[model samples]
Target: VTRVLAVANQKGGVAKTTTVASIGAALTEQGRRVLLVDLDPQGCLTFSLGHDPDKLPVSVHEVLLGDVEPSAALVRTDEGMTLLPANIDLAGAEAMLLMRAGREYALKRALAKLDGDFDVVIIDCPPSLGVLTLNGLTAAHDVIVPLQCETLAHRGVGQFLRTISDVQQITNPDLKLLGALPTLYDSRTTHSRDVLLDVADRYELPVLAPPIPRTSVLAGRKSKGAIAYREFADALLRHWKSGRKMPTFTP
Candidate 1:
């Protein structure tokens, strides 16, 4: 069975896109065929993979609007992974989708056509709880929330958990939280370290062991069209093979 995970967080600048890109690369390195879906209309994932969304002939928007089939819309990334790219056109899909009955299932219908083509499908959701996000939630069986370790950021966890509850109750009953992924983390700081511990204790959720560190290199080079596929691949393999062998965090 394909492991479809939605890398989601309703907060901006929290490394949602970065985490998705890295995790996708990591999974791909593990000999897993990965299909990354750019649900975020902003196309951060598309851009990070060195593809210009505006230059694309087809995108997730076209797939969602029924203009193109999901399989045909898939783009091969430089990293050798497949991506269902998205662009600004997706921004308008929300309104167009609302006009249709069962708008939340549009994404699932698109994905159904590409069934069994991928070992893993990573969906990158926008930083909001809108119709688009709902569609992604409906299509995905699991979720991976990328979180920043701060008091205010930590506080939003509950509300987002409620959104998950709503999605589970009303839309996708099989939806499960993979874990909380800590990003932009600085373990040396007592406040941040405590926040990490707090997340584990308060929520009773498995805080993914390797807290992604706040590093300009990973973020900067990625923005310049560089992917840490090698490093990510190793980290993910170690992580999956041994839950305790997590990625080390550094400033």
Candidate 2:
């Protein structure tokens, strides 16, 4: 089964794209065919993976509109994962998809065309809860909500939880919440684990182990930050295997 994982968060700068890229690439390291789709209008995922979004004549925007096939929009990243680049036009695609029937299924349908070509699909959902985000949630078997560890991190979380409930009730009932993966971790002022405990128990969400410490050293696959993400992939895969459905804050 192609395990579709949606890396979503209601708030921006919470490392949503970094999580998608790193884990998708890390899985490829273990021989799994991985595809990372960018759903953000900002196109950070595509840029992070070294693709020039503006140069793309084809993108996920076209794929969602039924004007292009997802396989046709693919770009290979330096990390060996496949990418479906999102263009600025994606911001327009959202408004267009809104008026269309079955808007939530556009992404799922596009992805289905390449169902046999990959072992995993990770989507970098936009920073907000909206039509495109709904598509991300609807297309996934598992959802990972990445959080920046801090007291103020709880600000928008309560609202995001409501979005999750709405998705489960209205669109994807089979969607599973794997829990929160903490980024920008700190044992200092915020005392990361303390924030984890507070958030976990209050929301009844499990805190995925080994919170990614706040670092600019990730260096993307060169070791430090990349290695931590590798550890995260191992931890993530093990957690997923448990059927427990369910890290860079690039602010």
Candidate 3:
């Protein structure tokens, strides 16, 4: 019953890593066993959780390459959540994975081996629709997109969903989009509000109730590795725990 969620957008700087770290920490606080996986070579999720990616003896790269078991790569952070760290070497794992029998299932296979170790697994995706991202898409049962409340945000939404649709058709039939989250959000700005509404209407994606507000204090604390948002985290946890069968917008 491990819920695998991919936090993806195919667009950088939209706070994907931040959301992963915060959400994982929040879930951990709620007494849920959480495991955050960093699929991006940039490894922001690893560092944000207060671990140095480069210093890790083992990382997601090893897991992807079958050199290390998922359990061996799991690291417990001071924040109480577990992490399958990633390093810059993961950027090249796609090339190595291309030669495997079930290339797309590299991640799924690794995770499947970790059966009951965690209640939730969050995969932080890179900014491109490359092989690594595809591995995440193929492995995850659901995806949660983090969008910047800007004009050009939707430009990539169509393309991102198109890739998701393709993956759903060719690979993971059970894959679904949990929702689209609007970050850097300001309620007072008309433009911000418009973009949020437009994205929701365009995709008709289920939004996590009371979206993460654009607050300097919240953002700053998150940057410093503080995770205690009772309300925001509770909403997402409720949806995940309920296991309600909702329709995913893209495919």
User: Residue 238 error for model 3, in Å?
Assistant: 2.3
lDDT of 1 by residue, 160-238 (tens): 7888889999989999876777776665668877787777777745676456666511242453123333454455455
Which regions in candidate 2 have their CA more than 4 angstroms from the true location?
216-224, 240-251
State each model's CA lDDT, in order.
0.77, 0.81, 0.78
Report the lDDT tens digits of candidate 3 across residue range 85-203: 99999988878878777888889999999879899888889899998889889999889887777554577888988888899999899998767766776667677767777777776
Put down candidate 2 lDDT per residue, 1-108, tens digits, no spaces. Answer: 788999999887877887887778778888888998899877888988887788999899999999997888998977688998998999998689878999999999
TM-scores, each model vs. reference: 0.85, 0.91, 0.88
In candidate 1, clashing pairs total 0
Over 4 Å off, model 1: 150-152, 216-251
Order by lDDT, highest first? 2, 3, 1
Q: lDDT at 165 for candidate 1? A: 89
lDDT of 3 at 18: 81
Global fold similarity of model 3 (TM-score): 0.88
TM-score for predicted model 2 compared with the true structure:
0.91
Q: Highest TM-score among the candidates is held by which one?
A: 2
Clashes of 3: 0
